[PDB]
Amino acid sequence: AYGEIDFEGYGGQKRAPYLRMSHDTDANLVITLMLKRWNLEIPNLVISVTGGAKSFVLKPRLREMFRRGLIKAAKTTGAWIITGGTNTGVMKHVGEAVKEQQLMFGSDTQVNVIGIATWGIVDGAMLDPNHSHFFLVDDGTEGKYGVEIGMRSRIEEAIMKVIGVPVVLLVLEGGPNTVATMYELIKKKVPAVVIDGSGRAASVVGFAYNHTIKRNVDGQTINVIDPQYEDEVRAKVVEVFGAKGADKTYSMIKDVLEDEKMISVYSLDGEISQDIDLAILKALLKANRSSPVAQLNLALAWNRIDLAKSDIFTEEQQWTTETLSAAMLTALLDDKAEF
Amino acid sequence: AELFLQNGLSMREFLSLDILCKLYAEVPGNTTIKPLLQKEMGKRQVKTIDMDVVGEVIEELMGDMFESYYRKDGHYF
Amino acid sequence: QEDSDKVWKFQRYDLVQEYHSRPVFAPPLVLLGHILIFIKIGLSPAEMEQMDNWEFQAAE
Numbered sequence: 284a285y286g287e288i289d290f291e292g293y294g295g296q297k298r299a300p301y302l303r304m305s306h307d308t309d310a311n312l313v314i315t316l317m318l319k320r321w322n323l324e325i326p327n328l329v330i331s332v333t334g335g336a337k338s339f340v341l342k343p344r345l346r347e348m349f350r351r352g353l354i355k356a357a358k359t360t361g362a363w364i365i366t367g368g369t370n371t372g373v374m375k376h377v378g379e380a381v382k383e384q385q386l387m388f389g390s391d392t393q394v395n396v397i398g399i400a401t402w403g404i405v406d407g408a409m410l411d412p413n414h415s416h417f418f419l420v421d422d423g424t425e426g427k428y429g430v431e432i433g434m435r436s437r438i439e440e441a442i443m444k445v446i447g448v449p450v451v452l453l454v455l456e457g458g459p460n461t462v463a464t465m466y467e468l469i470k471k472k473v474p475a476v477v478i479d480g481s482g483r484a485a486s487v488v489g490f491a492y493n494h495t496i497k498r499n500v501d502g503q504t505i506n507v508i509d510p511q512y513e514d515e516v517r518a519k520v521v522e523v524f525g526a527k528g529a530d531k532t533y534s535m536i537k538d539v540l541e542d543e544k545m546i547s548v549y550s551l552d553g554e555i556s557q558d559i560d561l562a563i564l565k566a567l568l569k570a571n572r573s574s575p576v577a578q579l580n581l582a583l584a585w586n587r588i589d590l591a592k593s594d595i596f597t598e599e600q601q602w603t604t605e606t607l608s609a610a611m612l613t614a615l616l617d618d619k620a621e622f
Numbered sequence: 623a624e625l626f627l628q629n630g631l632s633m634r635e636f637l638s639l640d641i642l643c644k645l646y647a648e649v650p651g652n653t654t655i656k657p658l659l660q661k662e663m664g665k666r667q668v669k670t671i672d673m674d675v676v677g678e679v680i681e682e683l684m685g686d687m688f689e690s691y692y693r694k695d696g697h698y699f
Numbered sequence: 700q701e702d703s704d705k706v707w708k709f710q711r712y713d714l715v716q717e718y719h720s721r722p723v724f725a726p727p728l729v730l731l732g733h734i735l736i737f738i739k740i741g742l743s744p745a746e747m748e749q750m751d752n753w754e755f756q757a758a759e
């Protein structure tokens with residue numbers, strides 16, 4: 284069953300197509316379907332927003348700063364927002380943020396909001412009427428959640444194949460499937476940005492990142508938990524989210540931190556006046572996988588001149604006319620005089 | 623007040639009719655609004671403050687046939 | 700004279716309001732226009748909320 288939902292007066296004239304999927308199918312067919320059969324441009328960025336759906340407690344200052352920065356990044360870049368297909372949680376707040384920030388602008392202001400979810404929850408939880416594309420995937424009965432995680436891993440891996448396209452992860456206020464998507468996207472070489480000081484699981488990732496840093500191994504010098512504060516993070520991962528079966532997610536959240544260049548933790552109370560797009564750009568320049576022209580035009584779209592002077596225009600990387608040409612056209616047409 | 627509004631509080635749930643009339647009741651005294659409200663309550667012989675007196679002060683203090691919404695809406699009676 | 704430009708801009712409103720309500724009729728025949736009279740926009744509510752959202756974010 285594939286087609287196009289017309290939501291019954293839920294805000295917006297444009298309709299959103301949906302596609303039933305199984306996990307047996309590869310992601311390359313999905314990418315050539317969404318770039319040719321559905322007519323989407325190959326973007327400068329893919330943001331993947333991840334958090335809670337049912338259990339979701341959020342601060343008003345934090346929700347306003349998060350939606351303002353995420354809207355600013357996704358509208359100045361023109362990025363794909365990959366979330367779940369749920370009408371409650373962080374997906375609902377991202378959808379309401381898109382709703383209040385896609386109405387009454389210029390006519391060429393539409394953010395391709397893709398939702399990867401399961402067919403076993405739709406009519407679990409109904410679809411959010413603010414998404415623009417739906418990938419509903421299943422293999423068994425209702426209640427299965429991990430096939431969403433596997434498709435969200437492999438489809439964004441194939442986005443990185445067509446690297447070509449930088450894909451970033453944003454994690455705030457989530458549960459066990461949130462950190463499961465975190466692990467499966469660190470497996471697919473997608474860098475992640477964790478909003479520390481936000482909720483129940485992103486605070487655990489932050490408190491495992493900056494409080495328990497340690498390099499005591501050979502084999503590319505991975506990061507693990509401290510033996511001093513392993514009891515505190517054990518009590519925090521067993522008390523704050525998840526009651527039973529916390530051992531697999533504790534070993535999994537220790538294995539998330541295996542690469543220092545792939546996880547980034549940007550708090551709220553540490554830096555308020557620093558926007559989330561600079562955190563995304565620092566994660567993409569920290570992962571060291573994107574092209575220099577992709578880092579360059581992401582710095583152009585976000586007016587990040589100091590990070591461009593620091594880590595994009597270094598000595599060892601040489602620029603020419605043809606690599607700087609489209610960037611120069613963008614900087615002229617958008618009035619970027621420092622660039 | 624700003625910190626309360628941007629941590630845990632909404633005006634929609636906080637403010638009621640009695641809180642608003644009390645908020646106009648304990649105005650300090652060095653203002654213009656306490657002589658204006660006491661002059662209007664002297665013109666109506668009512669010892670307590672309600673939103674109709676505040677509305678008439680706002681109507682005579684905007685001019686040009688302004689009609690304040692405390693006089694017309696049932697939420698402020 | 701230090702605010703002459705702005706006070707001309709302010710009285711231009713009064714001129715526009717003086718001539719916006721006049722009869723839509725011939726200049727020697729405006730009394731005939733008063734005979735033919737004798738014989739500020741509102742918006743949709745979702746459109747008003749969209750107005751309010753755009754105005755509030757420009758205020759932001």
Ligand SMILES: Nc1ncnc2c1ncn2[C@@H]1O[C@H](COP(=O)(O)OP(=O)(O)OC[C@H]2O[C@@H](O)[C@H](O)[C@@H]2O)[C@@H](O)[C@H]1OP(=O)(O)O
Nearest residue numbers: 333334335336337338339367369408457458459460461464
């Ligand atoms: N994708 C979902 N859509 C709607 N509800 C969900 C979803 N996943 C779980 N839940 C529910 O909410 C309860 C706990 O909610 P959270 O822990 O806040 O959800 P979580 O953060 O683990 O994952 C949400 C998903 O949405 C995205 O953030 C990401 O793909 C992630 O896989 C579960 O007992 C589970 O209980 P139940 O389904 O309501 O009986």
